[model samples]
Target chain A: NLEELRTQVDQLNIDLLELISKRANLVQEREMLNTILAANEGPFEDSTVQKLFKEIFKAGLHSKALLVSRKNKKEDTIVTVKGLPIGNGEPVFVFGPCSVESYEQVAAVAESIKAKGLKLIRGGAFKPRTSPYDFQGLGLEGLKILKRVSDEYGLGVISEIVTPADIEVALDYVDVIQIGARNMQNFELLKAAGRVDKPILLKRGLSATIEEFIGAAEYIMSQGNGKIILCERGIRTYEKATRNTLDISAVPILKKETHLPVMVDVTHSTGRKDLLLPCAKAALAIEADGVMAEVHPDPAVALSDSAQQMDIPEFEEFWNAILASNLVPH
Target chain B: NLEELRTQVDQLNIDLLELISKRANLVQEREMLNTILAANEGPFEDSTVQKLFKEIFKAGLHSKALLVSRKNKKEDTIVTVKGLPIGNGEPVFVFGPCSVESYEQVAAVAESIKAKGLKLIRGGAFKPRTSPYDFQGLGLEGLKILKRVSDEYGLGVISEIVTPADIEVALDYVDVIQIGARNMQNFELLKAAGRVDKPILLKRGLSATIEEFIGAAEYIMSQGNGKIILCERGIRTYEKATRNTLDISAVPILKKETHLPVMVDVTHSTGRKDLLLPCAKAALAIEADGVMAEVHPDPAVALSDSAQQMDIPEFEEFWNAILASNLVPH
Candidate 1:
């Protein structure tokens, strides 16, 4: 009787699947209808449909088929930039100025990065400031400065691209296109970045869950771009001691669940130069693909994120501390 | 031309609504058919339907009508337990043993709580330990012990209840029913707790985002019980220096978003005795409704969370530090 019941359950599943497939077809038709409606309307809020479809499409995929997960591909996706490998077991460090204020500022940081023998240099061109009046960054000019400094230093440049429109121009200047925490769930931006030929350094959203973070990576990988690096900056929580709560467990969870390299943004996560070394050591201990931090020629006078940026001397001490840690091999 | 487009968009919206309603009716019919099929089938993996419906229902609701946000409810919900108000601006402190190991253990802590003139006393009866081999709490016996201690000391009891089945029995013992970090997204348990008359102490999930955390509180309040205490016990991240990185910003963010009393669980967040006092002071500085930490008669031999739990003398010192801080008015 139990065996017969099991057969009936299996049949029900098939029937349900068939109905869902039909519904999906209807959803496609509705999307086409919305497109025509949108053309007439000129510009309607399409985010509702986009958001709804994202969840629906995600659910429709078998759990194992989630593009970012280890279930889909057991082997880690090692992204190589100028022969420097990330997610290939060797711990890498990405360090640079928080914002490229000028060619001089970027060049100073680039020289430090070069002297340290670090391959990756990070600088924000389009900074996502919370307030409208805050330093919004130097935009394309900052990217140009980063590119100039990086070229001179012979290092790979990583810079954040805020808007979908900037993705193309960003590709010319930066080795890696960074999706900042504020723009993590900006699906339009994510889709745009996904189409790019360059590697993407996707920071987890300020308030995004690990599932949503993974889904974000899927958005990129689904668009035929597999060179995606997951970064855990920190998450918003009730504590005020730190700028953001560094999600320490995210490294291992991301590594286990997805075949992508995970990096920790110690500078942004802690928002304090003092905690950077400890947090970096923790990141290394957890076997992160890399650790990222902000450094400046003089942190006291930095244009943006002045509080968290480590000066050249502080950066050296911090770098030395990480090198001395048992977590990393010399 | 724009006005005509707006009119067309409105008409399209109506058409879409009609189709969605029709689809909703079909879904109901399908559910009824599945129920009948399940009766014959004895059991089927109905989770697919459950998962799909959750997303569908969530999308169907007006975003502004989400019960968790300040937009939905203008007034803050201050839960009162034994005449002790939680969300009325006066910062409260919750201290107790990590687990109710023995009557003496709980009794000693209760005495200290009484001596300090503190109202809330927290202890875990049904602990959600990661490993099954770990001390799995005393369960109902622990609840009984908490009840006895609270009765003897005239202090309000706050203890964790892990299962939906235990909610009813737990009501008789705990003044505040705590939903631990592991069970933050356990919708079944959340809904079950939501139906009860007791005030719910809902902890942030180990790796949950602020939105997910708010959505979880929404699950409880939507079920007719609005008395919810949102506790941020840190989140899992890349850093291993601290047990969990306390998301300090969550206090201001949650306070701004929802009308719920926010508590900080310093013991679990830091998982280090050294950081507890500073973190507690920071919680107070952020204007948290309450601060929570663990204290045992003898933390060295505590059954669970031995490292974070402070001994009586250490707790006294910790409590004094909070009082001495300018953040808390003397």
Candidate 2:
């Protein structure tokens, strides 16, 4: 009786497999037709088509269809910024002020990064603040300051660009474009970044799924730009002990799911100067492409994120601990 | 030219909708066939069918096929335990020890809960710990203690059951069955809980997506048991500043997505006694169905999670504050 039931089950599985294969074919056909229609329609609500395709693509993924997984890529996507190779397993370090308060403030952090022989210098020109009363960054003036200091220090400038309109101007001043967590789902900005020549650093959203995170990368890649770096900057959760939960596991998950270089932002993730070093170690231990932290000349008087931004000496200590840790190669 | 392109896009959308509708019909047909086959073939490989159905269901959801979103359910599913209404827009508070260390420890919490006129009492009977050396909860004896205290105090007992085999016995002792964050993906345990008539409190996984969280509830509901309450207990992240990041936004997201009552575990979420009152207030502000926290006679000598557990007097102050806040009606 058991054998008879087992035989029926196997037969049913075979039939189910056949049906799934048929469904996969239909999905592919539908996608191809939609692509042609989308191209013909020019720039007419592409997101609608994108959303529909995402669902079909997700279905194809689950059904063992010959879908292109991140692993299917032949080589890792190493994003280069002014000859600096990211995602090469060398553990790049990015350090700068939380916000480009002034030319002097940015220059101080830039000089430190240069002295350490680090290539990337990060600062937020367009800081997205939760509170309206909080310090809104010094718009284009901050970008100009970053450019000036980057040239003076011989370091590549990495600064956040909030609006889609700022992409062209940001490219002129910064070597890389940073997309903050609040703007992770800003599809228009992502598409704009895709058309740019410089690398784009996309941070994980406050409450985004891994699929959505990857899909955000897909949005950029779909626009023919592959020089995209993913950054995990913690996510929103019920715990208030930390400003945010630094999703350390996201490093491994992102690396495995996407060929893109994955970095961790320890400062924003932890919101504590003390956790910067330990979280950085965890990031590197998990094989993140790079590690990022905020550094200011004097964190106490910083314009934004004063608590988490390490002072120059604290930055050196943090960097020194990273070097000493066996997780990184000298 | 732009108008012409827009017209083409609209045409494509209509065509796409038709194709999606056709696909939905095919999916229904396939599912119907699978159900018949599954019944005939006893102990069949149901996961394949379940996985296939999930994909089909997700596709239908995206395509706007009268999807059964929590919103689609007009009235909220109110889970009543001994005349205690969970999702009636009135906030319910569940308080007890983190783990039932002893009969005296549990009785102490029950007495406090009764004194405060609270109906629900939570204690972990089968604690699923990270490290092997950690304290494993007092299995059946712990359940017995909760049942005895609940009977004496006239309170509804809630305890975690880690194994499928333990569900039957757990139902006998506890009014509600809790599935912890670690065991959120434990489908067998969920299925076992579904088979029973008791209410199930399912926690969001440490790093699970909202979709996955909803899917876990779907697993329980699909098994013919609709009595489920969702609990948001923070998610793991890179931030070491707190034990976990409490995704406060998850409250609204879960409430909007599911008809089931949503609750927040402030103690586990924050891992700080100081934050318990504030977080609970936040939960009520967000219109959460329930708020859960850990309490002890003397948290200093508690066997587990001593830091977050509030002392008896602390619990009284916390309860008094909730009463004073006008968030909860006396």
Candidate 3:
């Protein structure tokens, strides 16, 4: 009986091997069928595949961008202007009075920012003030002086274009198109700028939700333009102790949500000169893409936003503290 | 040694007592000073004794309301109808067809719902359809049927009022006035209803934020009426699988935010009849004041929302299952 059982086991082993060989041949046939099936899918069907792969690719690209941005937090990436990189991922520290009051005043602030090694000189050529009685910027002459200072100090320039008409004229003097928070959702202005191949720094509206901010970006992107950066100035909240709630959490959320770089405007976020030093330091600690603050040669005498803007020395101290924090290396 | 220690302890205790008495007297003196200072300054000073007491009383009342509301998950203590208490810790189920086809149909649905021990009945009289050409309720005829059925079955009636003009006529036939999602922001209708004596069942807007929903209530309340109950049907989202995203979290948030009773419209929240039972159970789990659903004698033959409305036997089954969920007592 034992010998007969052993003979039965030998026969079963041969059968098992033959069955496995048959299954292997079936698997090869299955591979061929899969290839044929994949190819038979029409171009429209392939669009579905492309969409899926595109999403996957986008996800991967986003993750990769996060990693790359993290690594490049310190070194200023040069926003080139005719082959010149200013302040290189560090935004060019553009410091001047809110208005160019006089030639002496403009030259003083310009010389100070240049002495401190700031490569981007900023002065509002055409300011849009809420009150009609408030000092608007000094028109074309201001832009000319701004150009003169840029030439003198080998710095690039930045200014705001509040209206559609100003776009052509402002383009000549400014290296970056600065869209204010009020103009963030201005579709007409966004469309005009989208036609031009310039980087646009868009500010978040005071009461706009995160979704609204992104929708605004979608408007620009839909116009076949994608080079946009976000500026988190401040947001309205019940807290009245500060001018506006800085929305410190927004910096991190924006960075996570989009492929675009995020900059913090410390001057608007905290409307106090004393707070600028600490807040700017905190911005770096939070790993923001860049830090921006309104600075002037003399903050108290500045025509606008005098309380929030810092003097040249205060800015220097703010910059030094940012560097000393070691959150972002020089 | 024990006697000596006791003497020292007595001395320390006396000093502590004196310090506490001094502090207590100082607080009383400060109150008097604040009142005098307030009289010289203004009648309603932040630090005044009267204002302090008022704030303390308000806070205590808020806490009590919160505690009572938390205790009763399914009861809506409606003070809007002066004498009629719709929900008071009991599962108040409002059942009816989506639209009143005829007096015979609504009367039959009411009788069936009454047999199933449902207290409140709901039917759309002035339906707000997206397409202007869609069947927009039977209006006065539907209300007449509601009145007849309500009287016959000894049940309460709730009917939707779309326009400001209908509120006057609607008050006579309907026990509770229903405002649909589309008319949630119809401030004129809200104002008109707020002037009346009937209870308002305000549905949340499809895309309205929690703040907007609360503000909508405020719009009504500011018109001198406060008998408002909020209904959370659902919100619009990218997920097409469900008719709307049932924001279950809204129940807890709304309860915490306002002193209003909150209900869930299970039919509208999930348009699929299969999901109604599950979502109703979820509503109970989250401690909703009540659940409003569409029910018909014959759901298959129902004019509108036939897929979501439950038939007579199905309604009974659904009601019993909800009772089995162990949220509220009979």
Candidate 4:
């Protein structure tokens, strides 16, 4: 009976310590630590309890050295996706449909992209839509189509995945697993992403700060995966002229703060087909590593993001202009 | 002469009809819009040309807005400072020393403020300093001086109290408990300020998102304190041209998101005296509830933020220039 009671007390103490440690994450988790302190009804405990708890949290704060911080690795982390090096100081462009519709639709984009000598293709397989009634992406079927396009065209595939459970499944099909803005603070999703050895593209949240964006990137890196790409699509603000105000300043900030390659998604940031080129050019001027935009054979009937996606010929014209301007390397 | 003019008009009518018919049939639909982009050849890029052309063509986010949202409360919150009504569609200004150095220094600012018919004065006493070597504010000594000035001059005082325990101490001296951006997400401090009777001026955190900024306000309001003023003191951004990137759009966004009066800190936002007037005017044009700037007797020798603090004459000129802009309502 005495041994059993001692064992029970030991288990209770360890569980309490474990909960407190998990709650010590920089600033997000707080309630658990305070609740236990308020529930401190100990006849054998001294005033050392509060002091010990505070010291543990303080130590936890300093214990974290972000794997993605510039201090952690001074040199740029050049992520290789199917032979192309991102963050090597040479810019790259990734173009494709916003959502995978069919083999032919994706093939049309790949053919155009390959003709331009671009190697990476991006499309959404598991879209995170605001409305439940809207199209919820083609799921596994879309990924299969994307993989097919990738193998046939010899282009690397980049597709979005929504949940933690799908991160592993997504690895086999995607060259780069994209975590959308809506899921930037999805801690579990980020942890799952960080655990894998695959390259990840993490978009800044809808209204996330630059620090928050970095935190999301760290969440992945802390889990042992250093192959991550930071994407600044746009941020939600009061300005309504565009879908989101592209925090153009974020370009230099992310580069300066982290070693990861920073890319700008012009289509979503401005949500104006007219603005795609201008914004991308500005992003390039300010040291963004890559530019991303959506292109469809017929953008007028795309399942999602219709207004911003460019038609194939229009996208062709955009590339020719960029090539002529000599902003991007050959 | 009449016959000759009539003949010229007949020929012009044919010319107008030809151009109008050609334009209408050219690309009234999305399919034909692609060809328009290809024909662009000018000093301006196709992107620039399209922007100019689309200016003649086109025009046009939150679902389930927050409790702090305009959807939740249709009426604007008129925050009363001393006797000033802030958000009754009339703009106001809050000016004081950056820190309360001494009785004479504070009295001088109080004199200038009262002379301008300003009803509010702000000075930091319990400053949250990053460096131990920096001049941490005078603590209770600073608060005492501010209280003396407020009581003697009959102007309301706004000063920061960093710790939750100091919130009550602040209530005894300050009319408004000013929560600095560094402490915006300090939940305990927010809740403590909420439990009090004094109005609270909450600043957006250095890198806090608009949503998080609103969440901070809710943390206080959830404790039954609705008298809150939201201040956008710029944000931590990549642009070093200004101390911070003043999210100019945030004024309108905050107004739309919450019923609270929104203020802009032009001094802290743009750490340049030259930019204070211009930025304040821009803030005024977009409908900010108030503007905040610091004043000192001799900025070249003053304490912290000397580069941005306006000397007496510069501040006077700024006030007059803003008055002419008709932004600072009497």
DockQ values per model: 0.04, 0.02, 0.01, 0.04
For model 3, what is the C-alpha lDDT against the true structure?
0.70
Query: What are the per-residue Cα lDDT tens digits for candidate 1 across A16-121?
Result: 7898789878755356546644655424456765565566666654564888888899999999986789999998889998888888888888888888777889
RMSD of every candidate to native, in Å, equals: 23.3, 25.0, 22.9, 18.5
The predicted structure with the larger DockQ, 2 or 4, is 4
- The CAPRI category of model 2 is incorrect
| Candidate 1 local lDDT, B231-273, one digit each (tens) | 9898776545568777765776788789999998988987878
Sort all candidates by TM-score, best to worst: 1, 4, 2, 3
Residue A161 shift from truth in candidate 1, angstroms: 0.9
Q: Per-residue CA lDDT of candidate 3, range A1-330, in tens?
A: 999999999999899778756755664523434454477557556556556445533443223332214332433333455343432454434456666666667677667766766666667777878898998888888787777777777766667777767777776776777778888888888777666677677788876776777777767656665666677777654434456556544555566556666777767765656556555554554446667777677767778888877777776787777566544545
Q: What are the chain A TM-scores for all the models, listed individually?
A: 0.80, 0.80, 0.71, 0.81
Q: What are the TM values for chain B, all candidates?
A: 0.80, 0.80, 0.75, 0.79
What range of 10 consecutive residues in model 1 chain A has the weakest lDDT sum?
A36-45
Which numbered prediction scores highest in DockQ against the true structure? Answer: 4
Predicted candidate 4 versus true structure: per-residue lDDT over B1-330, tens digit per residue: 999999999999998778656765664644434676777666778777677556534521055665666787789888787898878888888998787888998888888888988899999887777897888999998998998999999999989989999988877888999999999999999999999888899999997877888999999988888889999887775545558766655666677668999998988876867667766765665567888999988777776887888878887898888777544456
Q: Candidate 2, residues B1-330: lDDT per residue as tens digits?
A: 999999999999999779768988885646565765567554556776566556656886434421225545656889997679899888888999988999998888888888877888999888888897888999999999889998899999889999999999887899999999999999999889888899999999998877788888888887878889999887776555457667655666566667889998988876767667766765676567888999998888887898999989999898899897666786
lDDT of 2: 0.81
Ranking by DockQ: 4, 1, 2, 3
Interface RMSD of 2: 14.2
* Every model's TM-score: 0.48, 0.47, 0.41, 0.47
